[PDB]
Write a structure and sequence with these properties.
Blueprint: E1 12-16, H1 21-32, E2 39-42, H2 76-88, E3 92-97, E4 101-104, H3 154-159, E5 165-167, H4 173-189, E6 193-196, H5 204-212, E7 229-232, E8 252-254, H6 256-266, E9 292-294, H7 318-330, E10 335-340, E11 348-349, E12 352-353, E13 362-363, E14 366-367, H8 389-400, E15 406-411, E16 416-421, E17 425-430, E18 436-441, E19 447-450, E20 457-458, E21 461-462, E22 466-469, E23 474-479, E24 487-491
Parallel strand pairs: 1-2, 1-10, 2-3, 3-6, 6-7, 7-8, 8-9, 9-10
Antiparallel strand pairs: 4-5, 11-12, 13-14, 15-16, 16-17, 17-24, 18-23, 19-22, 20-21
This protein binds a molecule of 6 linked components (GLC-GLC-GLC-GLC-GLC-GLC) (2 copies), a molecule of 4 linked components (GLC-GLC-GLC-GLC) (2 copies), a molecule of 2 linked components (GLC-GLC), calcium ion (CA) and chloride ion.
């Protein structure tokens, strides 16, 4: 469960948040495969509640109605078409599996669902699965409200209703089997693994019982005996009784300390300084690197949901954001997920975004096409961070330096730092309020190297900054503190 099952040499996945299956299928062939991406986390592919108050929020997809593959992203044929075409060019699909719960206990009964399935939350009836009253934890939960009241109590976090969401009785073999039937349906279509949503609200043993029932990956694309990649969403910032290490037996865990600490460092809040990143990783209290799924922001905390707080960097803070993502993608700790978002009319009232609910770009609920502009950016309000040159070239950086040790670290005692990855890549940052001009040891073979942050290598030429490494591995680096991108990166495959 710990290995992502990407094609060898492909080291990241991208969360194509709320994209449609047809758009993802095309993106695999025209972009993700040629640019060396490892895979795509898709939004939950199972039927959810169509919520109209407010109007079709992104988070209606975390309120399941059934396990039919029938959503605003597409129907089952399009989902299958996507996974096949993506696997056919060597780009994996990972499913956001919402398996802790069904919809909100207060949603109205009816057919307001993305496949029109009937469901009745008051009476606990989900006949399209089918689930009924004795498939939820109403009788297990001990809180007064029936919802989770106190996170210092590990048992109610598991058996009670996360913000009112009907809590599946994951102890029963029937519920475990119905979930496993859904997941095996996905696996045989060809998915490489799963994000387990709200894993902190499931017992590690119940998760295990579910995964024990799963097939091996589809043997047309994966070697025989491959198991699905598992990363569990556990928000563990410390000080709670539940520890993400309690989930290491099922697979990797999301490491939410990563983005919170890195964002604090890059914003230079709280006295933090990039020079402190010299022991980045477990030295900062993070989970072991082989159990970490890392990311700068995710779909929740880029909009104030979940956790991570004010320090989280997002596409809204683009200049610092590219630096954070670049550092993450260059540093060997963890398996990297890159966020890919859409813009929404973010409108802060008292420090709260009253439109943090707004769903994907849409006309009357029908999700807009991801259009591709002539400059390879996206139209229709898809941000497409994974197409930003500085991010995409760092995804390639991580591929190129895969397996090389962290080495040749430099810092100025403040916010000017550099480090290499064996003899295959080297990266230099200036986050101080003055300029950086220094000759550094790069660990690279002598030559002329395109900076892949400011430009590209294209047939014997660089379109941006050139870096000249001497026979002793030293090279001069010049970064003004007013630089648009105040960092430079070079690697073995940007060498002329
Ligand atoms: O056909 C007409 C029919 O309509 C209703 O039944 C339908 C129901 O509304 C609908 O949800 C679905 O039923 C599903 C059910 O939703 C699922 O939960 C699933 O049920 C299985 C269950 O989850 C398993 O735990 C297992 O049940 C065990 C129980 O754990 C035991 O307690 C014991 O049950 C007896 C119980 O002790 C007594 O208190 C008493 O209430 O009677 C119970 C019957 O013995 O033994 C069973 C062992 O079966 O196994 C369940 C079945 O696999 O799967 C159901 C089937 O889809 O579809 C229902 C049928 O349409 C309405 O409730 C019915 O009265 C009516 O006949
Ligand atoms: O039904 C009546 C009901 O109304 C209210 O609740 C509704 C709510 O207002 C509405 O926004 C929506 O809820 C959304 C939710 O806003 C979304 O954020 C989203 O949450 C899902 C999320 O995408 C998942 O990644 C996942 O995040 C969970 C974590 O897994 C949890 O561990 C937990 O994080 C806590 C963390 O564990 C702690 O360390 C600490 O940091 O506190 C954190 C609290 O954030 O919560 C996040 C939530 O983001 O799990 C989510 C489920 O998949 O999707 C939700 C569903 O659409 O729907 C609500 C119910 O309809 C009102 O709150 C209720 O009291 C009332 O009963
Ligand atoms: O879009 C702008 C703002 O909208 C969001 O909050 C809105 C809701 O989307 C609206 O629907 C409305 O909410 C009302 C609701 O319309 C009203 O029916 C009533 O809800 C009842 C419910 O119908 C009833 O069945 C039962 O469930 O009890 C509910 C009340 O407890 O009351 C709701 C408000 O209390 O108004 C709000 C506020 O504008 C969006 O999330 C906002 O951030 C956004 O600014
Ligand atoms: O009542 C629920 C309906 O659910 C399904 O809807 C149908 C529509 O009724 C058809 O009209 C059509 O939808 C069109 C849509 O009308 C058209 O504007 C355009 O929608 C998007 C487009 O997909 C997208 O690429 C974006 O860029 O722009 C447009 C929005 O501005 O194209 C849609 C077709 O792709 O087809 C859907 C379903 O395919 C259901 O099938 C209906 O039975 C039902 O009425
Ligand atoms: O392991 C699956 C199982 O976990 C829980 O049982 C726990 C209980 O919560 C602990 O407090 C103690 O009793 O040990 C048990 C095993 O770890 C859930 O209660 C149960 O429903 C679930 O299946
Ligand atoms: Ca639970
Ligand atoms: Cl996540």
């Amino acid at each position: 469960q710990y290995s992502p099952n990407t094609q060898q040499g492909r080291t990241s996945i991208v969360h194509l948040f709320e994209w449609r299956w047809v758009d993802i299928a095309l993106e695999c062939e025209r972009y993700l495969a040629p640019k060396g991406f490892g895979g795509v986390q898709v939004s939950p592919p199972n039927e959810n509640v169509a919520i109209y108050n407010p109007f079709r929020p992104w988070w209606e997809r975390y309120q399941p109605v059934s396990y039919k593959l029938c959503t605003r992203s597409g129907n089952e044929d399009e989902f299958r078409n996507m996974v096949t075409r993506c696997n056919n060019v060597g780009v994996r699909i990972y499913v956001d599996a919402v398996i802790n719960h069904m919809c909100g206990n207060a949603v109205s009964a009816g057919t307001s669902s993305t496949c029109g399935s009937y469901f009745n939350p008051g009476s606990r009836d989900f006949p399209a699965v089918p689930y009924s009253g004795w498939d939820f934890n109403d009788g297990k939960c001990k809180t007064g409200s029936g919802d989770i009241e106190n996170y210092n109590d590990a048992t109610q976090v598991r058996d009670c209703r996360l913000t009112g969401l009907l809590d599946l009785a994951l102890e029963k073999d029937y519920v475990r089997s119905k979930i496993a039937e859904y997941m095996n349906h996905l696996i045989d279509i060809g998915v490489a693994g799963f994000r387990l949503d709200a894993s902190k609200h499931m017992w590690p043993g119940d998760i295990k019982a579910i995964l024990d029932k799963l097939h091996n990956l589809n043997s047309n694309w994966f070697p025989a005996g491959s198991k699905p990649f598992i990363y569990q969403e556990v928000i563990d910032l410390g000080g709670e009784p539940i520890k993400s290490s309690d989930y290491f037996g099922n697979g990797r865990v999301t490491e939410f300390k990563y983005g919170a600490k890195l964002g604090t460092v890059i914003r230079k809040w709280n006295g933090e300084k990039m020079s402190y990143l010299k022991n980045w990783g477990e030295g900062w209290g993070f989970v072991p690197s082989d159990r970490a799924l890392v990311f700068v922001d995710n779909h929740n905390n880029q909009r104030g949901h979940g956790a991570g707080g004010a320090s989280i960097l997002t596409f809204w803070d683009a200049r610092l954001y590219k630096m954070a993502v670049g550092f993450m993608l260059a540093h060997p700790y963890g398996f990297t997920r890159v966020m890919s978002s859409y813009r929404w009319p973010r409108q802060f009232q008292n420090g709260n975004d009253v439109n943090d609910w707004v769903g994907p770009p849409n006309n009357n609920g029908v999700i807009k096409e991801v259009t591709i502009n002539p400059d390879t950016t996206c139209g229709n309000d898809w941000v497409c961070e994974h197409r930003w040159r500085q991010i995409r070239n760092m995804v390639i950086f991580r591929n190129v330096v895969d397996g090389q040790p962290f080495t040749n670290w430099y810092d100025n005692g403040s916010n000017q730092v550099a480090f290499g990855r064996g003899n295959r890549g080297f990266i230099v940052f200036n986050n101080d309020d003055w300029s950086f001009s220094l000759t550094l040891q790069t660990g690279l073979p002598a030559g002329t190297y395109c900076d892949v942050i400011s430009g590209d290598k294209i047939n014997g030429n660089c379109t941006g900054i050139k870096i000249y490494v001497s026979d002793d591995g030293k090279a001069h680096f010049s970064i003004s503190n007013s630089a648009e991108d105040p960092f430079i990166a070079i690697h073995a495959e940007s060498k002329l």
